Amino acid sequence: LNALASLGHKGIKTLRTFGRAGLMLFNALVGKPEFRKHAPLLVRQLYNVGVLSMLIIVVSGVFIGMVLGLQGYLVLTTYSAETSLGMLVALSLLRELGPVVAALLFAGRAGSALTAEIGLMRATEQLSSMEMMAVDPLRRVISPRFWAGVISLPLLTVIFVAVGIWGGSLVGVSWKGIDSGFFWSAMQNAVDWRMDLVNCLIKSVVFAITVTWISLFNGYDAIPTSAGISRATTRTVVHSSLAVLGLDFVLTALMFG
Amino acid sequence: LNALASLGHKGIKTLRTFGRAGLMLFNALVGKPEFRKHAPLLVRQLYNVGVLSMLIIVVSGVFIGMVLGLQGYLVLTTYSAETSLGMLVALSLLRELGPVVAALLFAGRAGSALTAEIGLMRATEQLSSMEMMAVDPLRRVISPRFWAGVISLPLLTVIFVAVGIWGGSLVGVSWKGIDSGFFWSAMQNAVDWRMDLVNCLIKSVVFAITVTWISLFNGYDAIPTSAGISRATTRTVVHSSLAVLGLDFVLTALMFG
Amino acid sequence: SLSWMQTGDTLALSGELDQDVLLPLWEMREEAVKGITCIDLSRVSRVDTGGLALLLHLIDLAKKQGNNVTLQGVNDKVYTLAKLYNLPADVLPR
Amino acid sequence: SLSWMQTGDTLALSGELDQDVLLPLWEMREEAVKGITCIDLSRVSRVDTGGLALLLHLIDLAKKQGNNVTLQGVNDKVYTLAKLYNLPADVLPR
Amino acid sequence: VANLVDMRDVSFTRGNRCIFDNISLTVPRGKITAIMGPSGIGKTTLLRLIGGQIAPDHGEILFDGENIPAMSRSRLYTVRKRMSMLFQSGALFTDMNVFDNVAYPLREHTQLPAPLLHSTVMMKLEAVGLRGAAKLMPSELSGGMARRAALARAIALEPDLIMFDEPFVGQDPITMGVLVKLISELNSALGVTCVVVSHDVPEVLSIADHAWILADKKIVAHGSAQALQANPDPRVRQFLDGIADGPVPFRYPAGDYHADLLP
Amino acid sequence: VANLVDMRDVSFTRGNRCIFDNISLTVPRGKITAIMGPSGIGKTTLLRLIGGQIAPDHGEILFDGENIPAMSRSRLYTVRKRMSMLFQSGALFTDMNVFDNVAYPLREHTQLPAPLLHSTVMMKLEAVGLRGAAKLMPSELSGGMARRAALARAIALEPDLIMFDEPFVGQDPITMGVLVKLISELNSALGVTCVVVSHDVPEVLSIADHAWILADKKIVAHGSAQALQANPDPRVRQFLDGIADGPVPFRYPAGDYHADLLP
Ligand SMILES: CCCCCCCC/C=C/CCCCCCCC(=O)O[C@H](COC(=O)CCCCCCCCCCCCCCC)COP(=O)(O)OC[C@@H](O)CO
Ligand SMILES: CCCCCCCC/C=C/CCCCCCCC(=O)O[C@H](COC(=O)CCCCCCCCCCCCCCC)COP(=O)(O)OC[C@@H](O)CO
Ligand SMILES: CCCCCCCC/C=C/CCCCCCCC(=O)O[C@H](COC(=O)CCCCCCCCCCCCCCC)COP(=O)(O)OC[C@@H](O)CO
Ligand SMILES: CCCCCCCC/C=C/CCCCCCCC(=O)O[C@H](COC(=O)CCCCCCCCCCCCCCC)COP(=O)(O)OC[C@@H](O)CO
Ligand SMILES: CCCCCCCC/C=C/CCCCCCCC(=O)O[C@H](COC(=O)CCCCCCCCCCCCCCC)COP(=O)(O)OC[C@@H](O)CO
Ligand SMILES: CCCCCCCC/C=C/CCCCCCCC(=O)O[C@H](COC(=O)CCCCCCCCCCCCCCC)COP(=O)(O)OC[C@@H](O)CO
Ligand SMILES: CCCCCCCC/C=C\CCCCCCCC(=O)O[C@H](COC(=O)CCCCCCCCCCCCCCC)COP(=O)(O)OC[C@@H](O)CO
Ligand SMILES: CCCCCCCC/C=C\CCCCCCCC(=O)O[C@H](COC(=O)CCCCCCCCCCCCCCC)COP(=O)(O)OC[C@@H](O)CO
Ligand SMILES: CCCCCCCC/C=C\CCCCCCCC(=O)O[C@H](COC(=O)CCCCCCCCCCCCCCC)COP(=O)(O)OC[C@@H](O)CO
Ligand SMILES: CCCCCCCC/C=C\CCCCCCCC(=O)O[C@H](COC(=O)CCCCCCCCCCCCCCC)COP(=O)(O)OC[C@@H](O)CO
């Protein structure tokens, strides 16, 4: 049939897109450490990825914690359990909202800016002129941006959870008048260091590897035109959000199932 | 002081950016109806905005409903209340997750593709060559894309809630073994048409006006270079996500407070 | 400003062959090229590409139901347009 | 392959003024231009831009602590590079 | 009026950079007028003053006797049907294949049937030599031919004035030879007044009847082709010959040596 | 070896389109060699075969006697220090102001102190006339001058071969006159072998010693400048003069009339 041959044609060129992505990350992270040449390159990329993402993370964390504090108050006040609001807000952020929503906003703001940057460096032949100076662009361009994304999303997640807990107490204690001794002490003996704090960090490291690898590859593999770069920037947001939400279900069934 | 004069300088040019955005939407939507010329233009834009966004909406809705069904099962099974899982899943989607998460994915996929499209039409002088043929580009280009975004985000939200409820029952009934007569009947007398179904549609229309207006203006006001278009595409995702989450708190305090 | 009057076998046009005033003469086809053998065209002011395409459709109609059709009276600027648009000799004679 | 030997007031260089073999002669400054009045340079093979910049720094050092410094023995291809790089007459004599 | 376009004494500013202090130029009817100059002077802004886009700061632009900056919006749209503009990109819409690009102004301001619209667009596409390319999309057009397809769109409404914005730029000698043949043919037939803005001196001077050289913000020279190859001005002779050094210096304005050479 | 570059019998394919069937060309040492041809033939791929980028399908490229496609990765990186390439964009890094662009290969393969690196870059920036522009960023560079700043970066490691990829394209006559003066000066001094790929015929032939014309996928003509302006081939004469019609037809391959003219 002429339909089965076209489906197997797209199934072959999907296999060698996964193979091109495995060769790009392997040749970027392996060989000849160079701790002194790459240390100024890491600090500049840690500004573009991490510092420039703090506005969308701090402002979104306060609003999300305030919605959680308002919506969880109306549920718990039926059963006279509204002193357990701090346990509800902190646990629903350390699982499933701190890791996930900070990864979806990292993929839209820093993941789009990384695909657009690398695809612009191939449209202006900057990566080909680095190979002519006998400098490997996979070690010099790709790998400082990889480690800047793996470092900065775990650091942005812990800021998201901190200002989200503060926004939840801002509704519960300050506006609704829950006793603040009951609010904070019910939270402190419900949050465990192993089941809650460590499992929040494992999720945000798995998400940081996935979002950064997808975002760096879609710029490196883009068609170097002004319309082909914009098509690859949209492809990062779709592939990162389907992979964050898909991996979030598998890690929820493992850690808390 | 030389700092107060620079702050008032940025406070003036922020006022006339809000004024340029109000003039762009007013001159696009007002005057000489033209129902026959714009009806083929609406159907093509309803493909780019609506049909091409169905993959990120259907796949994300199933995963989010499955995480809600798994995480809400472990809470309710302590108090022997696990037949109320369908009430918990449906109400937490009709408020605060159906409207919000479908608007954040609409802003990343369709909002980025609308800023990139219009800014490319100014970089190649297509909007200036339409004014030379005595065709107003605000009525011919901007306004069919506005109504396609206001129509398609309420339609994508109701698909998100439908496949999210199905994914929640897929965990509760099929995997965990809750009685399916108890599951569905507890949902049906908890969901009201006015407090839940109508309030879901009001939120997704307010979000559809805001996301589309931000996304169309940032392409129309972009600096028409290959680096200035990519800067405006990132600006859409930040401004839409801070406005969706900010308006979500104000509408939650009104509707359910 | 475009009117046509028939004298048996001539279809003497008069006025201007602009694009806007040709909708009467377009929607009077097969009723004006009945027994026409010649198109006079000596009393037209100027002609553009929209009017020249109507002239190609009248000669095509008056050939399929009849003879080879002749012309006269042209302005010798209808011939510069047929030079530019590269029209073959069988769709516009001489 | 670049060695230097001093004969009181001459700093006769020998070898090649490439970019790589100049780190000894760079880190022996103020110790080789003590009482130098003339730089011989008649026994150098070829010179590039990195070696020519070292030559500008020796004449600058041997002028601030002493006389005006003369040269000889050049290859007349050090003068085509000073023509291209537009060097003024006070930083490279004659 | 013998002059179709008549800029009286025009000034323009972009933020705080001054372009065109007090220029004055006339475009005769039926002739090809060239405007040449260096490659950063912003001379594509000159076609946007004539076209009824961004207003001047001080001056008077007359299209056939009527002032374009002092003109209503509805009066501007019916005057803009008399002039056309060919942009440097060949500004084609990126959907709508080459037939639908040429037929776009003919479906907007005309009442023609579906025949006589098929015949009109096929005649316009043949005058530029792209009748076989009628079903290709503009992304497959090999952009020397995108300027020819956007020239068939420009002659669709039979204008009086076509403004060309750098037709010969980055183009091969065969492609430049085609475009010189087309501008000469559309001026012999159809009597169109052409205004060409460029910095390709030997191609433009082979067709122009009157050139205007815009070296600084003034209008420092004008004349015919033979009367410009005998002008003795130093600023004019550097541009028309391609001298590396002159009143536009080869060296950037720098400091001195012996402070960066020997810091 | 008298020939620095020697392509024996090279073939290349991009997917299923064939470029360069069986070409053969030599680059003499110390001379300027031109490669000219039409504007869609993919002749910038010719500089990527020489540069040790994408491999041919069948052939032999010899850089000073050594085969580049049959060469190790570590052998390729130490040979690539002998050749340089100037891209059409002037491929400058978009951070790192003009001083840091020129000094970038000198901080990578050299051991020079912080003096003698300041003096070397200031001498290289003066040979192209941009010593005053040493602190500007490349976004402020007015891209005729971005090709001059990327020429100072190319002569930093003192190469044996510089490959120019369309130096004169979309450029003003004064800017083309500067670049012709610089390629002539860097060949008189420094003895560099230059390979220029272009389609600007009168500028390139004023400096080239041997030209090669690539009309179809073959290498249809070569010779000196005077020996090419007397060649009688029809494909050669259309390119060198700019004839609108010839073996490359002005009309697209179309159907016939009387089916779209009168459908
Ligand atoms: C004699 C007469 C007798 C009369 C007696 C009458 C009265 C008797 C009862 C009264 C009512 C009892 C009130 C109950 C109040 C307590 C309710 C409460 O605190 O729930 C906590 C919520 O945390 C939770 O996991 C819920 C946390 C996660 C929430 C899920 C995230 C929400 C969003 C989904 C993500 C979408 C994807 C991301 C979006 C893009 C569970 O913490 P927990 O204590 O269990 O400890 C943790 C460990 O044990 C796991 O359970
Ligand atoms: C592809 C490119 C690769 C780039 C790699 C990038 C960097 C990779 C990680 C960086 C730091 C990770 C921070 C995570 C901190 C959490 C580490 C941690 O302590 O968790 C332990 C389990 O971890 C676990 O299940 C295993 C979970 C940790 C894995 C999370 C990252 C997954 C990918 C990691 C791949 C590399 C790993 C190489 C290892 C050979 C729990 O034991 P713990 O003492 O607390 O009490 C045990 C008690 O319950 C009974 O004794
Ligand atoms: C320590 C723990 C380590 C665990 C390790 C587990 C390993 C997890 C692997 C992740 C791979 C992520 C790779 C990225 C794949 C992202 C998926 C994807 O590419 O998206 C679409 C397909 O979606 C799809 O069919 C649906 C795609 C699925 C999304 C990926 C899910 C990740 C795994 C979750 C599975 C849960 C199963 C639960 C079973 C109960 C493509 O369509 P589309 O042409 O429009 O493109 C747009 C453009 O081409 C428009 O022309
Ligand atoms: C004699 C001896 C006596 C012994 C007696 C002993 C036992 C006695 C009690 C036992 C325990 C009782 C079990 C309680 C089970 C019932 C729990 C339940 O169903 O909760 C529903 C959850 O819906 C809800 O609003 C919660 C819905 C919204 C959830 C919030 C969204 C989560 C995420 C946040 C968004 C972030 C931004 C978006 C992320 C980017 C509330 O529905 P409800 O019925 O109230 O009707 C709606 C209206 O009345 C408003 O409340
Ligand atoms: C800027 C460009 C503007 C473009 C405009 C784009 C399109 C604008 C709307 C389209 C359709 C909206 C669908 C909304 C459907 C919901 C409409 C609806 O029925 O809701 C009513 C309230 O609404 C309300 O609070 C008011 C809420 C509805 C507003 C939601 C959209 C906000 C912006 C709307 C602006 C235009 C409005 C022009 C009106 C003059 C409730 O009463 P209901 O009978 O159920 O029982 C009452 C019972 O409780 C006692 O009698
Ligand atoms: C029927 C109901 C109708 C209700 C109607 C209510 C009206 C609601 C108005 C929404 C306006 C939305 C306009 C979009 C504004 C989006 C805000 C924004 O622009 O983002 C940043 C500022 O954020 C900020 O300071 C914080 C910005 C606030 C975000 C906007 C919130 C919307 C209103 C929520 C307020 C809740 C108050 C609750 C009080 C208890 C800009 O920084 P930044 O230079 O990096 O730019 C990036 C680039 O320039 C990098 O160089
Ligand atoms: C720390 C540990 C955690 C690490 C987590 C690791 C996860 C991250 C790894 C790699 C991602 C890097 C990027 C990989 C490539 C990005 C995903 C990809 O393959 O791209 C397209 C998706 O195809 C698509 O239909 C999506 C196709 C399906 C995606 C595969 C689903 C996930 C794997 C389930 C197996 C299914 C097998 C069948 C099930 C039995 C294929 O382009 P296509 O051909 O259209 O060409 C046209 C044009 O779009 C580009 O050529
Ligand atoms: C409910 C909210 C809770 C409180 C929230 C408080 C607000 C959020 C706090 C911290 C996040 C700030 C992150 C710090 C970012 C600092 C990093 C930075 O400087 O970024 C530059 C500007 O960034 C910037 O957009 C400047 C960032 C501005 C931060 C937004 C302040 C808005 C305040 C007025 C809004 C009125 C609304 C109503 C308020 C009552 C970008 O240039 P770039 O590096 O490329 O080059 C350099 C050259 O261009 C900069 O001159
Ligand atoms: C259906 C009903 C619901 C409809 C909902 C309506 C909501 C949607 C309306 C308009 C959005 C359309 C786009 C408007 C413009 C987008 C937002 C905007 O103003 O842009 C930048 C944000 O400035 C910024 O610092 C963000 C500045 C603050 C944003 C204002 C917060 C929201 C309003 C709170 C008032 C605060 C006053 C003080 C509090 C007392 C300013 O660019 P800037 O100058 O940097 O130039 C440099 C370069 O970035 C562009 O020139
Ligand atoms: C848990 C999941 C729950 C079930 C989820 C089921 C999957 C999701 C269902 C419906 C959404 C599909 C939306 C339909 C989109 C149809 C619209 C469409 O045709 O879009 C074109 C392709 O789109 C496309 O990426 C083709 C879309 C492909 C849809 C993805 C199917 C992946 C199946 C294999 C994955 C293996 C993973 C493991 C599975 C066991 C884009 O071209 P464009 O219009 O510009 O021009 C035309 C010319 O280019 C097209 O030839």
PDB file of N, CA, C and O in Angstrom, chain C residues 51-86:
ATOM      1  N   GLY C  51      -9.787  45.771 -21.172  1.00  0.00           N
ATOM      2  CA  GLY C  51     -10.536  45.894 -22.406  1.00  0.00           C
ATOM      3  C   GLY C  51      -9.980  45.050 -23.525  1.00  0.00           C
ATOM      4  O   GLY C  51     -10.734  44.573 -24.374  1.00  0.00           O
ATOM      5  N   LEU C  52      -8.665  44.847 -23.542  1.00  0.00           N
ATOM      6  CA  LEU C  52      -8.047  44.006 -24.557  1.00  0.00           C
ATOM      7  C   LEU C  52      -8.406  42.541 -24.363  1.00  0.00           C
ATOM      8  O   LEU C  52      -8.473  41.791 -25.337  1.00  0.00           O
ATOM      9  N   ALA C  53      -8.653  42.116 -23.128  1.00  0.00           N
ATOM     10  CA  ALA C  53      -9.068  40.740 -22.905  1.00  0.00           C
ATOM     11  C   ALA C  53     -10.505  40.514 -23.341  1.00  0.00           C
ATOM     12  O   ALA C  53     -10.864  39.397 -23.723  1.00  0.00           O
ATOM     13  N   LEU C  54     -11.343  41.548 -23.281  1.00  0.00           N
ATOM     14  CA  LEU C  54     -12.694  41.430 -23.814  1.00  0.00           C
ATOM     15  C   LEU C  54     -12.670  41.347 -25.332  1.00  0.00           C
ATOM     16  O   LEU C  54     -13.469  40.624 -25.932  1.00  0.00           O
ATOM     17  N   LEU C  55     -11.742  42.062 -25.961  1.00  0.00           N
ATOM     18  CA  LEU C  55     -11.593  41.998 -27.407  1.00  0.00           C
ATOM     19  C   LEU C  55     -11.113  40.630 -27.870  1.00  0.00           C
ATOM     20  O   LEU C  55     -11.462  40.197 -28.969  1.00  0.00           O
ATOM     21  N   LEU C  56     -10.326  39.933 -27.054  1.00  0.00           N
ATOM     22  CA  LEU C  56      -9.917  38.580 -27.409  1.00  0.00           C
ATOM     23  C   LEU C  56     -11.074  37.602 -27.307  1.00  0.00           C
ATOM     24  O   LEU C  56     -11.076  36.578 -27.994  1.00  0.00           O
ATOM     25  N   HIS C  57     -12.049  37.881 -26.449  1.00  0.00           N
ATOM     26  CA  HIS C  57     -13.168  36.969 -26.291  1.00  0.00           C
ATOM     27  C   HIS C  57     -14.253  37.188 -27.329  1.00  0.00           C
ATOM     28  O   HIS C  57     -15.042  36.274 -27.578  1.00  0.00           O
ATOM     29  N   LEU C  58     -14.316  38.368 -27.939  1.00  0.00           N
ATOM     30  CA  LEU C  58     -15.283  38.573 -29.007  1.00  0.00           C
ATOM     31  C   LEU C  58     -14.803  37.956 -30.312  1.00  0.00           C
ATOM     32  O   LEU C  58     -15.601  37.371 -31.050  1.00  0.00           O
ATOM     33  N   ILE C  59     -13.507  38.075 -30.611  1.00  0.00           N
ATOM     34  CA  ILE C  59     -12.950  37.455 -31.808  1.00  0.00           C
ATOM     35  C   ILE C  59     -12.962  35.938 -31.681  1.00  0.00           C
ATOM     36  O   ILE C  59     -13.151  35.226 -32.672  1.00  0.00           O
ATOM     37  N   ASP C  60     -12.800  35.418 -30.466  1.00  0.00           N
ATOM     38  CA  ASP C  60     -12.877  33.978 -30.263  1.00  0.00           C
ATOM     39  C   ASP C  60     -14.296  33.466 -30.453  1.00  0.00           C
ATOM     40  O   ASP C  60     -14.499  32.380 -31.005  1.00  0.00           O
ATOM     41  N   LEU C  61     -15.293  34.235 -30.011  1.00  0.00           N
ATOM     42  CA  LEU C  61     -16.681  33.817 -30.185  1.00  0.00           C
ATOM     43  C   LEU C  61     -17.106  33.905 -31.643  1.00  0.00           C
ATOM     44  O   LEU C  61     -17.734  32.981 -32.169  1.00  0.00           O
ATOM     45  N   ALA C  62     -16.740  34.988 -32.322  1.00  0.00           N
ATOM     46  CA  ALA C  62     -17.117  35.189 -33.713  1.00  0.00           C
ATOM     47  C   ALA C  62     -16.306  34.345 -34.686  1.00  0.00           C
ATOM     48  O   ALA C  62     -16.510  34.461 -35.896  1.00  0.00           O
ATOM     49  N   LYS C  63     -15.397  33.507 -34.198  1.00  0.00           N
ATOM     50  CA  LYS C  63     -14.706  32.545 -35.039  1.00  0.00           C
ATOM     51  C   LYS C  63     -15.231  31.131 -34.869  1.00  0.00           C
ATOM     52  O   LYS C  63     -15.244  30.370 -35.839  1.00  0.00           O
ATOM     53  N   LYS C  64     -15.675  30.767 -33.665  1.00  0.00           N
ATOM     54  CA  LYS C  64     -16.150  29.407 -33.438  1.00  0.00           C
ATOM     55  C   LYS C  64     -17.502  29.164 -34.090  1.00  0.00           C
ATOM     56  O   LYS C  64     -17.827  28.021 -34.428  1.00  0.00           O
ATOM     57  N   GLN C  65     -18.299  30.214 -34.279  1.00  0.00           N
ATOM     58  CA  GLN C  65     -19.607  30.090 -34.903  1.00  0.00           C
ATOM     59  C   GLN C  65     -19.621  30.643 -36.321  1.00  0.00           C
ATOM     60  O   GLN C  65     -20.695  30.833 -36.897  1.00  0.00           O
ATOM     61  N   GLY C  66     -18.454  30.888 -36.903  1.00  0.00           N
ATOM     62  CA  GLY C  66     -18.418  31.539 -38.196  1.00  0.00           C
ATOM     63  C   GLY C  66     -17.059  31.598 -38.856  1.00  0.00           C
ATOM     64  O   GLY C  66     -16.322  30.609 -38.889  1.00  0.00           O
ATOM     65  N   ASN C  67     -16.725  32.764 -39.392  1.00  0.00           N
ATOM     66  CA  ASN C  67     -15.585  32.911 -40.286  1.00  0.00           C
ATOM     67  C   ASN C  67     -14.303  33.183 -39.510  1.00  0.00           C
ATOM     68  O   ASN C  67     -14.228  33.013 -38.292  1.00  0.00           O
ATOM     69  N   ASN C  68     -13.271  33.592 -40.235  1.00  0.00           N
ATOM     70  CA  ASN C  68     -12.172  34.341 -39.650  1.00  0.00           C
ATOM     71  C   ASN C  68     -12.549  35.814 -39.620  1.00  0.00           C
ATOM     72  O   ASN C  68     -13.055  36.356 -40.606  1.00  0.00           O
ATOM     73  N   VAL C  69     -12.296  36.467 -38.494  1.00  0.00           N
ATOM     74  CA  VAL C  69     -12.782  37.819 -38.246  1.00  0.00           C
ATOM     75  C   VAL C  69     -11.657  38.807 -38.511  1.00  0.00           C
ATOM     76  O   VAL C  69     -10.510  38.575 -38.115  1.00  0.00           O
ATOM     77  N   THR C  70     -11.982  39.895 -39.195  1.00  0.00           N
ATOM     78  CA  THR C  70     -11.041  40.968 -39.462  1.00  0.00           C
ATOM     79  C   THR C  70     -11.326  42.159 -38.559  1.00  0.00           C
ATOM     80  O   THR C  70     -12.371  42.247 -37.914  1.00  0.00           O
ATOM     81  N   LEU C  71     -10.372  43.082 -38.526  1.00  0.00           N
ATOM     82  CA  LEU C  71     -10.480  44.318 -37.770  1.00  0.00           C
ATOM     83  C   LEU C  71     -10.051  45.477 -38.653  1.00  0.00           C
ATOM     84  O   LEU C  71      -9.490  45.285 -39.733  1.00  0.00           O
ATOM     85  N   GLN C  72     -10.313  46.688 -38.175  1.00  0.00           N
ATOM     86  CA  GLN C  72      -9.759  47.895 -38.771  1.00  0.00           C
ATOM     87  C   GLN C  72      -9.670  48.946 -37.678  1.00  0.00           C
ATOM     88  O   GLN C  72      -9.799  48.636 -36.492  1.00  0.00           O
ATOM     89  N   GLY C  73      -9.380  50.185 -38.075  1.00  0.00           N
ATOM     90  CA  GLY C  73      -9.575  51.360 -37.246  1.00  0.00           C
ATOM     91  C   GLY C  73      -8.798  51.447 -35.948  1.00  0.00           C
ATOM     92  O   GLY C  73      -9.064  52.359 -35.160  1.00  0.00           O
ATOM     93  N   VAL C  74      -7.860  50.537 -35.686  1.00  0.00           N
ATOM     94  CA  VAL C  74      -7.192  50.495 -34.391  1.00  0.00           C
ATOM     95  C   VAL C  74      -6.223  51.665 -34.256  1.00  0.00           C
ATOM     96  O   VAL C  74      -5.864  52.323 -35.238  1.00  0.00           O
ATOM     97  N   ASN C  75      -5.776  51.911 -33.027  1.00  0.00           N
ATOM     98  CA  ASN C  75      -5.197  53.197 -32.661  1.00  0.00           C
ATOM     99  C   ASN C  75      -3.682  53.156 -32.838  1.00  0.00           C
ATOM    100  O   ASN C  75      -2.994  54.162 -32.640  1.00  0.00           O
ATOM    101  N   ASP C  76      -3.163  51.977 -33.204  1.00  0.00           N
ATOM    102  CA  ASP C  76      -1.741  51.615 -33.255  1.00  0.00           C
ATOM    103  C   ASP C  76      -1.046  51.759 -31.905  1.00  0.00           C
ATOM    104  O   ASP C  76       0.185  51.797 -31.832  1.00  0.00           O
ATOM    105  N   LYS C  77      -1.833  51.823 -30.837  1.00  0.00           N
ATOM    106  CA  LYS C  77      -1.386  51.627 -29.477  1.00  0.00           C
ATOM    107  C   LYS C  77      -2.023  50.404 -28.859  1.00  0.00           C
ATOM    108  O   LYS C  77      -1.614  49.997 -27.768  1.00  0.00           O
ATOM    109  N   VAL C  78      -3.023  49.822 -29.520  1.00  0.00           N
ATOM    110  CA  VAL C  78      -3.468  48.482 -29.180  1.00  0.00           C
ATOM    111  C   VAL C  78      -2.439  47.479 -29.663  1.00  0.00           C
ATOM    112  O   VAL C  78      -2.357  46.356 -29.157  1.00  0.00           O
ATOM    113  N   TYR C  79      -1.622  47.875 -30.630  1.00  0.00           N
ATOM    114  CA  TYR C  79      -0.593  47.012 -31.175  1.00  0.00           C
ATOM    115  C   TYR C  79       0.689  47.050 -30.371  1.00  0.00           C
ATOM    116  O   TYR C  79       1.464  46.092 -30.423  1.00  0.00           O
ATOM    117  N   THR C  80       0.939  48.129 -29.635  1.00  0.00           N
ATOM    118  CA  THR C  80       2.057  48.113 -28.700  1.00  0.00           C
ATOM    119  C   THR C  80       1.758  47.246 -27.489  1.00  0.00           C
ATOM    120  O   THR C  80       2.671  46.626 -26.941  1.00  0.00           O
ATOM    121  N   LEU C  81       0.496  47.186 -27.059  1.00  0.00           N
ATOM    122  CA  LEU C  81       0.142  46.292 -25.962  1.00  0.00           C
ATOM    123  C   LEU C  81       0.184  44.833 -26.381  1.00  0.00           C
ATOM    124  O   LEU C  81       0.582  43.978 -25.587  1.00  0.00           O
ATOM    125  N   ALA C  82      -0.231  44.522 -27.603  1.00  0.00           N
ATOM    126  CA  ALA C  82      -0.104  43.156 -28.084  1.00  0.00           C
ATOM    127  C   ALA C  82       1.344  42.782 -28.338  1.00  0.00           C
ATOM    128  O   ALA C  82       1.680  41.595 -28.335  1.00  0.00           O
ATOM    129  N   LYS C  83       2.201  43.769 -28.569  1.00  0.00           N
ATOM    130  CA  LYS C  83       3.628  43.510 -28.643  1.00  0.00           C
ATOM    131  C   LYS C  83       4.190  43.183 -27.269  1.00  0.00           C
ATOM    132  O   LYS C  83       4.984  42.248 -27.126  1.00  0.00           O
ATOM    133  N   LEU C  84       3.770  43.933 -26.247  1.00  0.00           N
ATOM    134  CA  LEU C  84       4.268  43.723 -24.892  1.00  0.00           C
ATOM    135  C   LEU C  84       3.749  42.423 -24.301  1.00  0.00           C
ATOM    136  O   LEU C  84       4.515  41.653 -23.717  1.00  0.00           O
ATOM    137  N   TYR C  85       2.460  42.150 -24.457  1.00  0.00           N
ATOM    138  CA  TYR C  85       1.865  40.948 -23.893  1.00  0.00           C
ATOM    139  C   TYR C  85       2.132  39.706 -24.722  1.00  0.00           C
ATOM    140  O   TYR C  85       1.654  38.633 -24.339  1.00  0.00           O
ATOM    141  N   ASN C  86       2.854  39.848 -25.840  1.00  0.00           N
ATOM    142  CA  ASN C  86       3.344  38.746 -26.670  1.00  0.00           C
ATOM    143  C   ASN C  86       2.194  37.914 -27.226  1.00  0.00           C
ATOM    144  O   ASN C  86       2.191  36.688 -27.149  1.00  0.00           O
TER     145      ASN C  86
END
